[PDB]
Design a protein around this ligand. Structure first.
Ligand code: CL
Ligand code: CL
Length: 211
């Protein structure tokens, strides 16, 4: 189970020189892929309010991201990636305060409805660091373009235990600086931009309740 359940990440807005600097560091373009995700939430965006993200990826399956360090690390920084459907069901019941063995079965009972569906084109780069001669010596950089035109990058470390997260954060920040990402720069998740575009009243309601 070598990869790890915990995503540590930093989103950014790509520029013309991002891939070249990745290459010059020894990074490689591992693949280019296109994937369709459908996201689910209550009409109140209860999951999004709790920094939970539930999606079913075509030809891949369900995933629930939920914060690994809620209240300690800011949103869009660390997520446990839940893919075993019984764990997803348990965590959804927990967050939403509610006999489903699979996620499809729980949507009705929990009041979860489709809130977005869209396709992303991704260039997945990986950087093996120090020729692999260190702990967790691979960082991923995804360069995504959503079908609505939004371009977003993510520098990502996948680790196994919360105790690895501080070091992962440090390495992601250092790689981010080398790719030319301003320290203060933020970039919204694709789903948030989808809501801005196509469900602007939901996006406004989200801003209001999150404050
Ligand atoms: Cl397994
Ligand atoms: Cl995103």
């Amino acid at each position: 189970m070598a990869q790890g359940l915990i995503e540590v990440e930093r989103k950014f807005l790509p520029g013309p020189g991002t891939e070249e600097r990745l290459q010059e560091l020894g990074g490689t373009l591992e693949y280019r892929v296109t994937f369709r995700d459908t996201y689910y939430d209550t009409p109140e965006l209860s999951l999004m309010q709790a920094d939970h993200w539930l999606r079913r990826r075509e030809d891949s399956g369900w995933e629930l991201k939920c914060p690994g360090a809620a209240g300690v690390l800011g949103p869009h920084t660390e997520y446990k990636e839940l893919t075993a459907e019984p764990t997803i069901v348990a965590q959804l019941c927990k967050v939403l305060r509610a006999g489903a063995g699979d996620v499809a079965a729980v949507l009705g009972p929990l009041g979860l409805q489709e809130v977005a569906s869209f396709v992303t084109k991704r260039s997945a780069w990986k950087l093996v660091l120090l020729g692999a001669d260190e702990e967790e010596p691979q960082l991923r950089v995804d360069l995504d373009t959503a079908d609505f035109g939004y371009a977003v990058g993510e520098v990502e470390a996948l680790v196994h235990e919360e105790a690895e997260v501080p070091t992962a954060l440090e390495k992601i920040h250092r790689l981010s600086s080398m790719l030319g990402v301003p320290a203060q720069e933020t970039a919204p998740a694709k789903l948030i931009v989808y809501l801005q575009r196509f469900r602007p009243q939901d996006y406004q309601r989200l801003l209001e309740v999150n404050s």
